Amino acid sequence: ITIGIDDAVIPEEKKQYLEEADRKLLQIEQAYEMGFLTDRERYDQILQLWTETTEKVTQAVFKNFEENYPFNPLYVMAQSGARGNPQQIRQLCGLRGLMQKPSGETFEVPVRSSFREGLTVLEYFISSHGARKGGADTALRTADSGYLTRKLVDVTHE
Amino acid sequence: LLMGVTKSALSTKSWLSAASFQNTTHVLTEAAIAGKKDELIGLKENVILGRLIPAGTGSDFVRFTQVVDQKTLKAIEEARKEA
Amino acid sequence: MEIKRFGRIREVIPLPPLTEIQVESYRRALQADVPPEKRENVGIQAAFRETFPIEELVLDFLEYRLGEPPFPQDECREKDLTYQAPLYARLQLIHKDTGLIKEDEVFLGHIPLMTEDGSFIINGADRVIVSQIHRSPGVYFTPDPARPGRYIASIIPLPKRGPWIDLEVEPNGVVSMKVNKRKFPLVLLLRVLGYDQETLARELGAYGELVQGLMDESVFAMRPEEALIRLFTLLRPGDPPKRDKAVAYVYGLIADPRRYDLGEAGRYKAEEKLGIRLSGRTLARFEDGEFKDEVFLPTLRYLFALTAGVPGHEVDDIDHLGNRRIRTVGELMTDQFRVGLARLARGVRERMLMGSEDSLTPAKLVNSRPLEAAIREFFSRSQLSQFKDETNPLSSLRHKRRISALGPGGLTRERAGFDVRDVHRTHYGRICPVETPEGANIGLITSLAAYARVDELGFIRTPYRRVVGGVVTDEVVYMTATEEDRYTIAQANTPLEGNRIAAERVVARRKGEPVIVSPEEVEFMDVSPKQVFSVNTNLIPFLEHDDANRALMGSNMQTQAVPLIRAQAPVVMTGLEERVVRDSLAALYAEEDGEVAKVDGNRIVVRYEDGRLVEYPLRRFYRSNQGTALDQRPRVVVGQRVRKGDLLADGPASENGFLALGQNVLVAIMPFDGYNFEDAIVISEELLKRDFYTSIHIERYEIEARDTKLGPERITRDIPHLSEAALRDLDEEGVVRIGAEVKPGDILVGRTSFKGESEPTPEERLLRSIFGEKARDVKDTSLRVPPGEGGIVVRTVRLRRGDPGVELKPGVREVVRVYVAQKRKLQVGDKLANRHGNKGVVAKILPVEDMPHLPDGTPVDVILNPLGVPSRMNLGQILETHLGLAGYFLGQRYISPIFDGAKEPEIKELLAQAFEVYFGKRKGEGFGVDKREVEVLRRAEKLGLVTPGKTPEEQLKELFLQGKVVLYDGRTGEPIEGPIVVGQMFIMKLYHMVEDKMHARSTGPYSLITQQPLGGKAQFGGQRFGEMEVWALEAYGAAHTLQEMLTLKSDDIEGRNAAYEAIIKGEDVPEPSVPESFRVLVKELQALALDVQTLDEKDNPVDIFEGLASK
Amino acid sequence: KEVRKVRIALASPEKIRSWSYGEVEKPETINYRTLKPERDGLFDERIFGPIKDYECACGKYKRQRFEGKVCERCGVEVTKSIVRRYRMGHIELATPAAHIWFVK
Amino acid sequence: SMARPVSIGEAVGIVAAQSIGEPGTQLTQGLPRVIELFEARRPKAKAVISEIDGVVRIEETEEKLSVFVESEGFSKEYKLPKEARLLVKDGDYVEAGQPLTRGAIDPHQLLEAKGPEAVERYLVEEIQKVYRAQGVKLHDKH
Amino acid sequence: AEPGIDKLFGMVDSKYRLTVVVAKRAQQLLRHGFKNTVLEPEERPKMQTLEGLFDDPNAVTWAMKELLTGRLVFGENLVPEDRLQKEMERLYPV
Amino acid sequence: MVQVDGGRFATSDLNDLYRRLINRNNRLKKLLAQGAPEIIIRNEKRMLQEAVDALLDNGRRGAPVTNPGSDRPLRSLTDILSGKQGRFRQNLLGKRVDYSGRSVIVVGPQLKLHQCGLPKRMALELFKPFLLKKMEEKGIAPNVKAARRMLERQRDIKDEVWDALEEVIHGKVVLLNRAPTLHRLGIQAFQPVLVEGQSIQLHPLVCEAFNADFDGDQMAVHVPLSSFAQAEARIQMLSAHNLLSPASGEPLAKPSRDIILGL
RNA sequence: CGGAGAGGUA
DNA sequence: GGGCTAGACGGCGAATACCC
DNA sequence: GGGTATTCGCCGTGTACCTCTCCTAGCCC
Ligand SMILES: [Mg+2]
Ligand SMILES: [Zn+2]
């Protein structure tokens, strides 16, 4: 068992899905500028389209692994339950997905690159938001969990 | 009546547990006025006093078990029959 | 070896001096060298002009100067002094009535000086002042949280320089002003400031519906004097509303330029936001006995305009980096100096009434005590003055660039929520989004960017290249965030032909929002990706393939590397290693062209072109603050010709000017018999055989001799009841000789102290009678080596009483210090890590013959677990490993900058080149493919890694181009059933070593009050059995174990004594008793007039004190 | 016996005066020079007990043969020094004062 | 821990408290919901529950909304915000303590309406829902 | 795991009763210097040191093995404590 | 009132509070002895009341009384009783213990499920009294005092004492703990095996229960003394007898990354 | 061998 | 020179605030 | 007089370990 940079296999369907998503986004923009749907509906449909593209590319990644590389190390590590979940495998092989602003709103453009292909400085700075958010979340959750545990212990100690 | 875990813990009858928990001054004043008597029922009180907690091997259900072999038991039985 | 470098982005500017943030700030603050006649109104001069002149005889200030340091730096480090300079001030006292002029230069204490690197020496220790981030003063407008359509107008002066003024539009219509938790209608103060009903009506009339809430006839009736009286009654209830008190209070609250000080940055922010011109740094002025407005009317206008929805009025984000500023060491020192000077001024005012009112000389008036007290307080006890972290030069270089949001006038750990911890959109290019402490301090502590510099006002600026038309110019502009939000900024990696943008559509930013833009709308462009990250993060190659959560740990762990005696620069560098070593000032560089005249392990003598013969002494085997050994090594030879800027001496953890914190090792990625389980690491013994990862550490012990009322303590070779073997290594003066090896228990310094008068117990009287030995009047207080330590003694420092030049603490005759060194090899328990965040402890050290080896016979050194990659998502290490394999087989090093580096096809080409060398060599010596290689090739073609039909050589090449080679098992000899990734990785040895952490205790000291065992490894204490451990033991239902943990191994005194005796006698332990802490609790409760009574089952009292407390 | 209950109740001035072995009347704590305890201070040896086991302050009785005895010279009882951890003092206020716990 | 009848004398309260508290650090509503549930705090956006049985009758003003629970002898009126989502269609019989609006139920009102057993069951289920959503297996016993 | 821990848990109604029985038997064995055992010389617990096989000094192991044999009788209120101690010290002096 | 090793005095704030109270009480007695006007006696009695309040509970009312030249409020009796640093939660529900140790952990794949690798030095320090007894039994030392004076120094240790130590720990167990202890399986009983080095060798399968990884974690060792504690540990707390989690009932000691991968 | 402040590890 | 003296956030319960 | 409604003061917010520094100031005999 080993891990090489070529063990993260990029499927061919990713390019077709991205081109389809680009033409769909162009159609959405053209339909918006004609006054058919407002800004809220445009934002919502963009998010919907990108989520559908993400799930599609995940399915494609896993079908490719299952069909052409049944013994690929990442696929084996995911299937056997030893390490990793489908989302991290997608982030390695597929596309990074959508990142959200610090206020909670989701960015309009997604991170179309993967760690296997390498990001750009802008996308990295974008994902740093969610990274710091999760870190602070854990750091502030630990103390509340401890306090709850102590309260419960002291209420049912007898 | 329904009350949260905090109030339910603070309103207990044993004043040592409530004193060690939270709001020490309030519980201590109320207990001192009421002249309360802690019966050492829970585990925290017995831990504070450094006694044997009433759980596990300290439980009153098994704490008094005796062990004796056949020979000594037979000898004691003979000694009691001749008494 | 050859150095190959990739990348196409050409940077137009080099990095600024990495430590300018401290050095330039302090140099501006002091103004030491500039002639006094031309000093600007900043820093010390500003504080002097602010405090002086004090009326009450009128004392006036003219100028100041700084003397010479009494002792050089190393001397202060030696004798625990503060490296400081004396500050003199030429003051003249003028008698207002007659005209007496008494001018003289008074000594006002000392000021600590900054070293050449940017750190201070306080009491012999190296210290660093950390810059602090906070909210910029000025005027802000925020949305009202509860009432939606309303706004809050805040006016905030400098910290501790005035109160926070709040303005709100109440629901009933009246405008309420809040100061110091006191709310009142703003109309009263508006009347006080000289405003009339007609004036407000004509000014604010554009927005009617709020003017009616502003109109109040009751206050318009009374003159500003009665309004001021009523206002003072509203602010200070209970105080007699005498007119002078009200005037003085309101003046000191608003119009006093000494008590209320809006910032220069604050005044600039106000002029920019409100679009007005401020004559001074106060809200209002006390002129002609009345008050005159400066700020309140325009900000009220702006608020009433905004609340109505006029275009052009926007709320302000309190996290926008145009609203937050940085205080450098200069500003903090100036603030503390101003506080001390104000105390000195009020003291002088006190002395101007007592004493002889005629015979007064400024030497008699001023007392230097408060200024020295304040400055020493700041430099010693302040929350920002931190112990320097100098494990390696990079560590101190990072510490000098750290930015904290805590400290005086800052957030606390409890009041820090999610908002202050987040990454705002304006940190791009100013604050590193990656590097931050992990844990509770996350997000509160950060690091400056690479190209970021701090201007005179305190805002962080970043450079951008100007883009006019479609051509990218070369002149850079340093911009702040407020100015940055007005343009469209392209990215750094856009395609370029010459100076023209070659791409039809570029990726740009507008107010932090990413967008696609046509070239003609591009106004600015980035300089380089380096400007987005800090200095630590800029050293991690292939960063574009690593998750942020792991690059964080990598950046943090690079700081904790230990300087090895055989350090090596990495095989894959980012091109920033030389600048870090040059700016850390660890190394020694040639000043000008010339020739080396003398080179020795102690000093280097250089002859320059000028003819002057310069001599640089090399700091050799010096102990850092953390215990590591810093030393310089000469890298030239006699007769060598050197130019300007060439390397002369190699600093600690550096290899020919390149930063070298670790070593390059041949690592293979595979699981190995469970020894890699969960981040563990297997290493070869070859690393220990050739002295890899060997580091030197220095421990320092200190003992004092002091005067005791029973007689003075003495240091002497004569100690009672010691065999000569224990005194073999001591000299005549009781100190160990330099070079003697010391082990746990041995004596470092012999010291005798007069025996305290005590009656010998009749048992001891019997022993003394039967043995016939007299007890000595002195007893052994010698310093001994603590358990687990030891090594070689290298230096002994001795400072007595009555010896010239040194001073000690009162009561101490002499003090002796001993330095002990030891070479720490790698062993089971030490911590290793690479730059991409992979860390782990060494779990097994195998012999050389058991390690997997390449077919040509070379064995790998380290074995990593592949199961760490997929969940951590740090693929940078795999690419670094491929490139390291290519380099190891080609014999060269590579430089791949961040986000513009070696892509995959170039690595494939390099790997093909390396495979040629690796295979054609074996082919020439008369060897084909091995049988085991053929079997592995078959098994690999069954896996789809190679193409079927090709010859074994072509399949081996196809495997090599993916970074995989065939390995053999050192134990069995058969090959691994599949190809395995192998390559060179750069691994550093961290500072947390098992030798410093292992600890055990059977019995030892106990505390006085609670009679429980002490804590910490230093005092030979025991571990803490916390509350949760008690919960666990209860859940197991183990009652006797818990009872023993609470009494026998604890503060039950007679219980534990009887337990020890019974154990050494062979019986079972006795039954415990009530702990001593419960008795302490009972007595404490009795101290509060509360009777606590223990009772039996029949409610009768039970004495737990055994009549000791019963009369 | 065996501890089975723990009762807590208010303490009358009578029980307080019964707990104490003497009144503290001088704010001094210890002689700064000799390091001996000040007379009638917060650390007095006649009130709270001896410092060294089985030894009076003036040095008249220094053995376990004398226990419970009170030295006439120094006024100290000769017992184990551990009693310095248990015995309590009392201050006699000139005017009554309200316990803050039962007020605020 | 042994898959057999529990032994007399086991400390069950501590085990229950630990089994509930240990997986807390994995809950990304979540932990605040669990906390407000264990403290029986009145929720902020609380639903409305029918105190009495009867048939539902909606009355909708263009600016106001109301629900009428109509029995044979009794009638009860509840005023609701305009945007409050409804979980009952007109002409339906609802039990006492049945939620009308979407949201969290105030435990004290449920106790006054439906009695203790309903509150205990509701609390158990609502606390279990969070650990279920977070993929944490935990017995209802604790 | 311990030898025959399953049969040990089968013998009692509560694991804590088994723990108490084992502890008390071990204390008895320690007090009476192992010469009051119920085991046979061939099944005594053995310990392998550098010299050879010897008697295991751990009393708890002896107690668990003895309980596994089945020649022990344990329960509540079998005999007053003082009478038990007197008869035990009389049969096996110290 | 402790004279620190440096010769300086460290005084509990109780001493300062008592000094202030006795000062004001003597002042009030002296004023009452002379019969001052009502205002002086009044403000003196007010100061006495405030001093008593500060002694019993400082900071409860008004500004907290502090030392001259400091802002730190003095520590009254109430502040000593309550709080996380107070007497209850610090010295009563949790204590420091003897016969304990702490070190770094390292995976050992060769150990059984009920074993743990323990360094020789930590074992020699923890089991010191039993080692002295065993050394007195055999001919290694004449008495326990000579044995202690023999063991006090490291360069005086011969090899027979290692065989004696191996004889001592035969069958005994030690408790391993890792903070934070979230559930009852954070403390587990293991049989020690004397190994070289300075790190604690741990079994792989128990890593999930402790939630411990090998990126530098540390663990604490405790030793139960008497036969009762030894039985309680060997029967109920042994790691080989706790295979199912009390929370859900599903196994905890189950295969993991490398094992599952290989299988 | 008591308390504060700072940094760090898990 | 030493000794002496002077930029959260929630809940919880009582106290008004206020309205009928 | 009563039945809410607000608000104002108090208490509370993880465990374990390691390193270092620093613990009053002024005046007069
Ligand atoms: Mg870890
Ligand atoms: Zn005497």
Numbering used by the authors:
A (entry chain D): 947 to 1104
B (entry chain D): 1420 to 1502
C (entry chain C): 1 to 56, 64 to 1118
D (entry chain D): 3 to 106
E (entry chain D): 1210 to 1237, 1254 to 1367
F (entry chain E): 2 to 95
G (entry chain D): 527 to 789
From the paper:
Another class from the dataset without ATPγS was determined at 3.1 Å, lacked the density for Mfd, and turned out to be a regular TEC. The clamp, a mobile structural module that makes up much of one pincer, undergoes swing motions that open the active center cleft to allow entry of the nucleic acid scaffold during initiation or that close the cleft around the nucleic acid scaffold to enable processive elongation. Compared with the structure of TEC, the clamp in MTC rotates open by ∼14° and the DNA–RNA hybrid becomes disordered due to the loss of interaction between the hybrid and the active center cleft. To answer this question, the structure of TEC was used as a reference to superimpose the structures of MTC via α-carbon atoms of the clamp, revealing severe clashes between the upstream dsDNA and the RNAP β1 domain. Therefore, Mfd would not be able to bind to the clamp and the upstream dsDNA in the same way as in MTC if the clamp is closed. A closed clamp is critical for the processivity of transcription elongation.
Mfd is a highly conserved ATP-dependent DNA translocase in bacteria. It recognizes stalled RNA polymerase (RNAP) and removes it from DNA, leading to Mfd-dependent transcription termination. Mfd can be functionally dissected into an N-terminal region (NTR), an RNAP interacting domain (RID), a translocation module (TM), and a C-terminal domain (CTD). Here, we report the single-particle cryo-electron microscopy structures of T. thermophilus Mfd-RNAP complex with and without ATPγS.
